């Protein structure tokens, strides 16, 4: 629709590209195997919120009714853009920031915005990834350290916060890290945890020192292991009988929790996040294979599994959630089995989780006086399934408890954490690719000191900012990022693809591209959704952002080791000096889309 003066003469125009095939190997890397290409795309998409936020959002939207707004946005918006993602990087055969230069050169705020989101999410994930290794260092041993309480100072029973709450948590607010109360007070620096952060930066830098070459040989193992070990953990769940309890909690269809506005919203944010989008490394990934490679069914293949395996990941955790809730359901009851015979004294054989309550009626009938002194702790499954956690606690203060309900409890403590390490590490590649592909499109730096020297400039450049997360206050900074950083601005970066291909590039100009790559135009629903449907849905959920922008006041949790009714959290708001930086972390990636064009308009006027 737009004229674009100078639209062409920057693209390779469909008739010389067959000749560039036989000269690309001397200038650019290549996928040296068919099998090594599939290992890259699955590992960047999966995990890290599909494992902790997506199964949590099951039981906050209705368990057995959660799939319906969830599964559709696979087959309405994911399967367009990923097939669109494959088709242009194989067309232009060039980096992502170069793409929005070859289309309307008053653009290229977009290639920055892909880099300005990919660099921060690559930062604070490695903070989480370091704690995966930290608890893995704390593995290997007979009495796992979170299992027991530290004593008091008198060689007797335990300290107060390990008495008032479980030993799995206490080892988190002093052990994992020393904790602060608020976000406004920075405490200890956690210097040994800073060493654990430091080594986490290096196994990345070891593996992508030569970009496609070193990663292409180091993807054959890290992209198969996080799916196998998760297969025996499923039978481990049916080994310890604790399944069919959170499993039936996964099958609770709440039709009342479907017409909510945030039901479509929270489903829409995760399906955009379950795939790893708006980074541009996949443009370079689809530039390193053959030109006539079928990516149409490859768009069907890899999009299906990551939406299908994540459901199967949600099965294994609720078996554990059902397992932890199972034994805790009777622990208070066995205490009350003890508390019944405490004051009212039945023989220990003729008491069980049975007519216990009926014999309690005979106890109250024989005497009400001592019956008014025996307190009983009422318990219920869905009073033990009704507690939950999101973000971090599922593997750190929830999963490690049922780890300690195993006969080989230090051994499965090891096997849990290499799986989640390589899970984030495989997802730590395209955000790493999202910062180097616009970097090769900068070219104001000296072009000497080749890529291995440039590789050392990335890992030590972003080494520095993770230091504030090692503070006692540093965990409260991390709660900002999963909530705000990359929640809203991920959408409209993807929306600028829709305006470019239809009204600037021309969908019919894209139509002659697809008969070149594979041949004949695909099924007609492909051509429908690029016109209308993906432009429709992306702004409805963006409209739902303004519904949840300010309709609930911003509040973050504080721990307070000296808390009033201590075994619960405390939710306080932020100070006014904290409000000045919350717009910086999520807003400045969105400012560059008009922002460079204003600099470009005063540069060319």
């Amino acid at each position: 629709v737009l004229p674009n003066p100078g639209l062409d003469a920057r693209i390779p125009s469909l008739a010389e590209l067959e000749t560039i095939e036989q000269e690309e190997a001397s200038s650019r890397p290549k996928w040296d195997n068919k099998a090594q290409y599939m290992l890259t795309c699955l590992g960047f998409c999966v995990g890290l919120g599909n494992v902790w936020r997506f199964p949590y959002l099951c039981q906050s939207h209705g368990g057995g009714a959660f799939m319906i707004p969830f599964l559709i946005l696979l087959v309405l918006e994911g399967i367009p853009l990923l097939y669109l993602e494959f088709a242009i990087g194989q067309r232009l055969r060039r980096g992502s920031l170069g793409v929005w230069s070859s289309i309307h050169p008053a653009l290229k705020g977009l290639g920055l915005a892909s880099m300005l989101t990919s660099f921060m999410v690559g930062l604070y994930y490695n903070t989480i990834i370091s704690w995966i290794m930290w608890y893995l260092f704390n593995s290997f041993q007979e009495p796992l350290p979170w299992s027991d309480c530290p004593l008091n100072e008198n060689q007797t029973g335990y300290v107060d916060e390990c008495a008032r709450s479980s030993p799995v948590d206490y080892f988190w607010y002093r052990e994992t890290l020393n904790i602060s109360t608020s976000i406004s007070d920075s405490g200890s620096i956690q210097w040994w945890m800073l060493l654990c952060l430091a080594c986490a930066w290096s196994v990345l830098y070891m593996c992508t020192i030569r970009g496609i070459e070193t990663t292409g040989k180091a993807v054959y193992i890290t992209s198969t292991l996080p799916y196998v070990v998760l297969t025996i953990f499923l039978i481990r769940g049916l080994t310890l009988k604790g399944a069919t309890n959170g499993i039936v909690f996964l099958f609770t269809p709440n039709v009342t929790e479907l017409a909510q506005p945030d039901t479509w919203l929270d489903a829409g944010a995760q399906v955009f996040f379950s795939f790893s989008l708006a980074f541009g490394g996949l443009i370079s990934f689809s530039s390193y294979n053959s030109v006539h490679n079928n990516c149409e069914k490859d768009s069907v293949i890899v999009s299906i599994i990551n939406g299908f395996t994540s459901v199967y990941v949600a099965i294994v955790v609720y078996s554990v959630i059902g397992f932890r809730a199972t034994q805790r359901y009777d622990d208070c009851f066995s205490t009350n089995i003890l508390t019944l015979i405490n004051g009212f004294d039945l023989p220990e054989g003729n008491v069980t989780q049975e007519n216990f309550v009926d014999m309690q009626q005979r106890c109250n009938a024989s005497d009400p006086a001592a019956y008014a002194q025996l307190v009983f702790q009422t318990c219920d499954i869905n009073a033990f399934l009704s507690e939950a956690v999101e973000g971090t606690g599922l593997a750190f203060i929830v999963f490690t408890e049922a780890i300690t309900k195993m006969p080989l409890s230090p051994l499965w403590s090891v096997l849990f954490f290499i799986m989640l390490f390589c899970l984030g590490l495989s997802s730590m590649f395209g955000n790493m690719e999202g910062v180097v592909v616009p970097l090769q499109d900068l070219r104001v730096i000296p072009p000497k000191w080749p890529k291995e020297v440039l590789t050392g400039l990335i890992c030590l450049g972003t080494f520095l900012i993770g230091f504030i997360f090692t503070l006692n206050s540093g965990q409260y900074w991390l709660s900002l990022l999963d909530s705000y950083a990359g929640s809203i601005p991920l959408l409209i970066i993807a929306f600028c693809e829709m305006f470019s291909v239809v009204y600037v590039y021309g969908v019919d100009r894209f139509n002659k591209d697809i008969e070149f790559m594979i041949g004949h135009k695909p099924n007609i629903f492909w051509q429908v959704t690029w016109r209308v449907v993906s432009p429709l849905l992306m702004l409805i959920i963006f409209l739902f952002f303004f519904v949840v922008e300010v309709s609930q006041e911003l509040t973050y949790s504080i721990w307070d080791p000296g808390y009033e009714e201590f075994p619960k959290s405390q939710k306080i708001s932020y100070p006014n000096w904290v409000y000045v930086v919350v717009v910086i972390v999520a807003g400045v990636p969105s400012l560059t889309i008009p922002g460079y064009a204003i600099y470009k308009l005063i540069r060319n006027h």
Binding site: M133, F140, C199, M206, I209, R210
Partner: peptide
């Protein structure tokens, strides 16, 4: 002294040598 620094001590030695192995390959492929 510490058990978590024992398992930390072996993985910090793995990290130092693999980066210079690929340095020798890139210098042999100049």
């Amino acid at each position: 002294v510490s058990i978590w620094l024992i398992v930390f001590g072996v993985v910090m030695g793995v990290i130092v040598v693999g980066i210079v192995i690929l340095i020798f390959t890139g210098i042999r492929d100049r």
